[PDB]
Write a protein that binds this ligand. Structure first.
Ligand SMILES: [Cu+2]
Lengths: 28, 28, 28
């Protein structure tokens, strides 16, 4: 279960990283 | 403990969904 | 392992709160 939790956490970090890229794009 | 962690991940997923909708609202 | 998972979740929460504040600051 811990492995599956580490899997969901890794996808959340990747999705947040993409959200930060769009915010940086909107700023420009 | 692990249940507590599960409730945090589900709450995090819902905020990320709301953040995407808020970004879409600002673009419009 | 659990100590590291809580540390990542606590950091993700802090990142989401920063994103919500910064998104409100943006003017299209
Ligand atoms: Cu919001």
């Amino acid at each position: 279960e811990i492995x599956a939790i580490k899997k969901e956490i890794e996808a959340i970090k990747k999705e947040i990283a993409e959200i930060k890229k769009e915010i940086a794009x909107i700023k420009k």
